[PDB]
Design a protein around this ligand. Structure first.
Ligand SMILES: [Cu+2]
Ligand SMILES: [Cu+2]
Ligand code: NA
Ligand code: NA
Ligand code: NA
Ligand code: NA
Lengths: 620, 620
């Protein structure tokens, strides 16, 4: 009955049937995106309407379409032809990846470049990468992928150990033509293998690790109802899944006494960009928008018990659409479980004689995705004390190149002749806030240092200041770790028992933001990533910080266009967009497979409750 | 046989006997500090000499002494009379705490101040706090504690809920005289109780938490030999315990192939300061040096199974000296166990068909201490991939005051009439480095942004720069989160297989440092806390960033005096001192007992290994 339930296989099948009967899903059509739409603001009517948004690609060259369908009514609500030179190309299709390697395999320029290097074409894998927007006027309005080559010595070989530097090709994947092959010179293909399951590389495996057994003899403390509704330790939420964004959290609320108090209306990772910092023309165009260009949800892994998720695990298995509109289940694609989290609160009081210790725990909701060489884990945490935390886990195999003779200012050496270009992994969290309801505001909180003098005779005082952001034009903020800068989202019309507005405090990790020159293509396409915090007024169609169509889209759309409306955000329905990321200078220890590195953020209650919300936790 | 073994009850008893027979431990003497000395540099002779350092207080007013004793020989090696007006007073004695309240209970000025407020003296608890150095010339050379009052309504009442503001007393604890009683005006004593085990405050306890069972059916993966030597997953170390510093880690090394490779020679939290930022004269003098003035090790808790430490726990029970030289065991004062730590490395490769997942774990070594209202957990972590991490956990009851009518810029309101002054908790980690041996250096690594132009035509390149710190005068560094600043400790005479110096990278949390005016007493006594990173040349007697005698010591000693020697630190035996802390603006949720907040730092391998050190971890 819940409007926020996961899409069903039956719904996707109805969507396929509605599109087909409407004439919109002929043999030359492909579904490049399909997803359920959230209910619009003011849905207390119970007049539910399950609608899906669909991007339809055409492999013959005809214009793609954006289509909105009502499953509940069985109708096409709207269908628009897209001018992709203007508004951007559709996301990359899984079936287009293999096209690149097949097309290059019969191109005379490509074969000529491989012959010069004595490489067997049957052993050359091509990584199909998004193209971006640069100086090539012939690419505008076409679907281009760019290809970089790696040698696979045998079927189970790790091709990433053998990059073919100095060589790159551009491919029009609709007309099936290789537009350019650029060969800047022969580099030795690095010879060492990177096969991390080869006994001659690992050595004898350890026999020293004794097992750790985590079990829940009475089952877990959370309940799942209606497929995706979670209740756990006073928290209430709905777990969504979208093929672009992945896990989306809806209706995050906390049961305080007998009031269910809203906190966050929708939480998601709405974009992630991976810009590379190597100025070689072979790679200087390389920027992955994993969310916007590739859709991270469609490459979610099936998570294995005892390996990927340890403990008493509850799985969700979301359903997505394939390119033809058939439903596809991602078996065990979301893990949910609770974890012990050490000490929650502890005091031994000399005067009262009372010794008191309570333990903390957290609820974990996670999925893992694989895009080529990269693997990313997305983790959402709910803590007993009201803290909400997001953590991204980055692993997989680093993207490689040749390491040039004479070194490099922009590439790390991993092995003889093998390099790893510098890069960043930058995320955008979109937090549609609802602190005790939808009337919210954001204040920026800085520590304030005070000068020794009258009123501060011993020079020990320090304070803080809070600045309300009142309009979108002043709501583009940067971090300042040195002044302990945080941001507070409050409800000015909801007060705690001390008559202070209730709030939550966002704590950032204060990592560097986008490093590229401000005049670069990537700085214009990934403008969100140049600033730590953006606050917009809620609008139905303002979903992604990069806009709806990121692939080969020139720039401007997304957050810079939204904030130019300069809307009132002081006690209004607002959306916080937080940029955070890792700057990766690869180390020898990252090779041949990288140990996990992490980045994230958290929100903690700030006078939201009238006292500690965990006084009723028992000793156990 | 190991020179780094824990002190035994037998050793402390021998120390007591040696002091007594030497005439240095008469009835008027008290031991204010006793601890084993580390072996000096170059101890390959096997000529072990177990020596103890002792601070001896005299309750009759005679000069205290510093004494060094050889247990192995049974001799007094040296004994020096201390001039405390010059070099500082001895640490506060546990027996001096109760003296403050007893003395004030018969002082006419104190009783007069309590009578004006209608407070029964039998119900008034006095927090005995360290005095620092301010404007009172009569305090120089005397042992002063300052007292702040709280009302306990009944024996099991939390006195912290009832501060008596506007009132403070100073007490000479050797002459047993109240030097000053300052009454600045009557504030209402806050009436609400803060009794977090009272059912009328907690409400009915939760019945929703199902148990989490963590067990190790084959026992733990680490071994303990010689009382305190740990071997675990290629790590090797010795766990020390000192009454001042607490847990100290010795000889941290990693088994790489068949080489035992040193990393850190000694790791400890060598000071921690808690400065308060309220300019009221009642509290503007308030600064706790928990390590230097109080000795955090002597107030270590006994940790309970299933509550404080969960899982398959191995305990150490360190022995310390009481004030008379009798040995005292801190039963179960150190917890040691291993914890699952999620995914270590994961990749699903399309081209090779190989799916690979390995899990991480960490070794945990921890203790908890209680100083008055405060409780602190100290946690050291060793990870499979070579990462070392420290985490401090802050909980307990916030220090309280009245909340003034008309508000405050320096105090938070927690409850009707109840305030919590702003403050910081700042730690100093002393890392005696030994990266592949003792020839080390420190480089500061900043991200470098590059301008679009020739050689960087697309404006995407970025780089990094490393600056070697060559002499102590240039080795006082500050954080720069915006430029991703880290510090690398390398060995320039030990290279990895790519012929790069091996190293470890220190990652700071980049929290604010000391906020007090630079001209303040606390900024001069806690100079270490004004800067994020200091590097000194190793010296036997340079143990603490604040010097040996912190209590009532005027300033200068410690790190500013050490670095004025301007010694060579470029490929030498060096010590890294890292400052890190929490700036605490108390929130309503911190009352009546505070949920844990955390701060720390970590060190990760940076080309220390020739590839990932965790390829030989099995799938399990
Ligand atoms: Cu990376
Ligand atoms: Cu605090
Ligand atoms: Na355009
Ligand atoms: Na909102
Ligand atoms: Na002095
Ligand atoms: Na050293």
């Amino acid at each position: 009955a819940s409007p926020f339930r996961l899409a069903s296989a039956g719904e996707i099948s109805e969507v396929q049937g509605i599109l087909r009967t409407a004439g919109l899903l002929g043999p030359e059509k492909r579904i490049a995106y399909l997803g359920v739409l959230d209910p619009a603001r003011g849905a207390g009517s119970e007049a539910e309407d399950r609608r899906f948004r669909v991007f339809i690609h055409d492999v013959s060259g005809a214009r793609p379409q954006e289509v909105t369908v009502s499953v509940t009514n069985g109708t096409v609500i709207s269908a628009v032809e897209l001018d992709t030179a203007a508004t951007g190309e559709l996301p990359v299709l899984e079936e287009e990846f293999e096209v690149v390697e097949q097309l290059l395999a019969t191109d005379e320029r490509w074969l000529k470049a491989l012959a010069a290097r004595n490489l067997d074409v049957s052993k050359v894998r091509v990584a199909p990468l998004s193209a971006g927007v640069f100086e090539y006027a012939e690419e505008r309005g076409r679907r281009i992928l760019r290809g970089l080559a790696f040698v696979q010595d045998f079927p189970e070989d790790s091709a990433w150990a053998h990059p073919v530097d100095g060589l790159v090709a551009y491919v029009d994947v609709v007309s099936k033509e290789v537009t350019r092959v650029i060969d800047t010179g022969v580099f030795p293909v690095p010879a060492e293998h990177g096969n991390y399951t080869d006994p001659e590389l690992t050595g004898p495996l350890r026999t020293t690790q004794k097992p750790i057994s985590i079990t829940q003899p009475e089952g877990p403390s959370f309940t799942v109802t209606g497929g995706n509704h979670i209740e756990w330790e006073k928290w209430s939420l709905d777990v969504g899944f979208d093929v672009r964004e992945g896990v989306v959290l809806h209706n995050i609320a906390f049961r305080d006494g007998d009031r269910l108090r809203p906190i966050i209306n929708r939480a998601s990772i709405a974009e992630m960009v991976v810009p590379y910092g190597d100025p070689s023309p072979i790679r200087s165009w390389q920027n992955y928008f994993d969310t916007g260009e590739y859709l991270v949800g469609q490459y979610a892994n099936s998570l294995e018990l005892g390996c990927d998720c340890l403990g008493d695990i509850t799985y969700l298995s979301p359903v997505i659409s394939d390119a033809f509109g058939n439903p596809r289940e991602i078996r065990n694609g979301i893990c949910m479980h609770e974890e012990d989290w050490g000490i929650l609160a502890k005091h031994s009081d000399l005067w009262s004689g009372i010794n008191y210790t309570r333990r903390n725990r957290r609820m974990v909701i996670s999925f893992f995705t694989t895009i080529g060489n990269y693997d990313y884990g997305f983790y959402w945490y709910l803590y007993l004390d009201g803290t909400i935390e997001f953590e991204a886990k980055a692993t997989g195999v680093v993207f490689t190149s040749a390491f040039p003779e004479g070194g490099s200012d922009n590439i790390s050496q991993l092995a003889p002749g093998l390099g790893a270009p510098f890069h960043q992994h930058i995320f955008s969290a979109r937090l549609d806030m609802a602190i005790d309801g939808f009337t919210n505001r954001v204040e920026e909180e800085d520590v304030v240092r005070q000068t020794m003098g009258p009123g501060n005779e011993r020079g020990n005082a320090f304070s803080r200041k809070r600045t309300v952001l009142t309009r979108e034009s002043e709501a583009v903020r940067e971090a300042d770790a040195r002044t302990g800068r945080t941001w507070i989202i409050s409800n000015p019309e909801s007060k705690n028992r001390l008559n202070e507005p209730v709030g939550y405090k966002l704590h950032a990790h204060n990592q560097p933001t986008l490093l590229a020159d401000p005049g670069s293509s990537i700085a214009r396409r990934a403008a969100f990533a140049t600033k730590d915090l953006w606050v917009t007024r809620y609008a139905d169609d303002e979903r992604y910080p990069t806009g709806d169509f990121v692939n080969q889209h020139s720039g401007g759309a997304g957050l810079p266009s939204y904030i130019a409306q300069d809307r009132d955000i002081d006690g209004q329905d607002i959306v916080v967009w937080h940029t955070f990321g890792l700057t990766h200078f690869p180390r020898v220890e990252d090779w041949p497979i990288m140990p996990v590195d992490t980045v994230g953020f958290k929100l903690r209650p700030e006078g939201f409750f009238d006292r500690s919300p965990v006084l009723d936790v028992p000793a156990n």
